[PDB]
């Protein structure tokens, strides 16, 4: 018996696949978010405060 | 035109402590942020640490924590670095810097000459 | 912390061509990254910042691009004075600032 595959299989996409959100996400904060402050935050003056008494 | 001499190295055994000093010159200090850079001797620059404008805030990289010690003095023009608990691999050329000064920026423009520490027996 | 990777390591090339140096972030850095040219006996000088802006007294023949983890340094046309080492720097967000190992660009 035949024991290819079969060329002729459907090879378009399924325009029937589930078009929705997930309603069973993961709806939670993440708990292994950066808890650190940012190194990188501009340690300079700002020139832009009010120079008036 | 904006000079940075920095002092106060030398050659000092392990687990001794050492100060550094960046004294500035016609640079305006107290607006704007300082570094440490360490350059090793197999060619590789590590960042150390920064101090912000008013030292209310200080960072370090995590082979230095706890061990150095950055202070500010805006009054006589200086950045101060306290080097505490070496090891061999503390023994490299340290170069002071000056950040930009932009409003995301993390670069260096003025970059001192660099003063030499070793740790050795 | 972030491995900042620049490669290649060394590259000759002789006076008046086209040179081209990248470096490689294990993880996404955006646009914080920062070139530095390093002649022997002299600390780095900056040239680029925000990966693709020239630095002010930086020469037109000195560029920068690229986006994420694949950045390049491009120049224009090497001079006798452009032989030197080059270093790329991250100051990426809640991230520690870490440089490159440094390209050695050599004569001929």
């Known amino acids: 018996a035949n024991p290819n595959a079969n060329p002729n299989a459907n090879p378009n996409a399924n325009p029937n696949a589930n078009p929705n959100a997930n309603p069973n996400a993961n709806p939670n904060a993440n708990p292994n978010a950066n808890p650190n402050a940012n190194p990188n935050a501009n340690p300079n003056a700002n020139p832009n405060a009010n120079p008036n008494a | 035109q904006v000079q940075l001499v920095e002092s106060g190295g030398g050659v000092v055994q392990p687990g001794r402590s050492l100060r550094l000093s960046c004294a500035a010159s016609?640079?305006?200090?107290?607006?704007?942020?300082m570094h440490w850079v360490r350059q090793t001797p197999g060619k590789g620059l590590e960042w150390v640490a920064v101090?912000?404008?008013?030292?209310?805030?200080?960072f370090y990289a995590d082979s230095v924590e706890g061990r150095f010690t950055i202070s500010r003095d805006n009054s006589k023009n200086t950045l101060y670095l306290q080097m505490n608990s070496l090891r061999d691999e503390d023994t490299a050329i340290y170069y002071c810097?000056?950040?930009?000064?932009?409003?995301?920026?993390?670069?260096?423009?003025?970059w001192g000459r660099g003063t030499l520490v070793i740790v050795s027996s | 912390d972030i491995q900042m990777t620049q490669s290649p390591s060394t590259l000759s090339a002789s006076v008046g061509d086209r040179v081209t140096i990248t470096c490689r972030a294990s993880?996404?850095?955006?646009?914080?990254l920062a070139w530095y040219q390093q002649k022997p006996g002299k600390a780095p000088n900056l040239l680029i910042y925000?990966?693709?802006t020239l630095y002010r007294g930086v020469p037109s023949r000195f560029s920068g691009s690229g986006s994420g983890t694949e950045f390049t340094l491009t120049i224009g046309s090497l001079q006798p004075d452009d032989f030197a080492t080059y270093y790329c720097?991250?100051?990426?967000?809640?991230?520690?600032?870490?440089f490159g190992q440094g390209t050695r660009l050599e004569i001929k």
């Open positions: 925000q990966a693709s």
């Open positions: 016609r640079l305006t200090f107290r607006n704007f942020g």
């Open positions: 810097a000056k950040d930009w000064g932009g409003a995301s920026d993390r670069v260096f423009d003025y």
């Open positions: 720097q991250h100051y990426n967000s809640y991230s520690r600032i870490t």
């Open positions: 993880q996404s850095v955006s646009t914080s």
């Open positions: 101090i912000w404008h008013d030292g209310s805030n200080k």
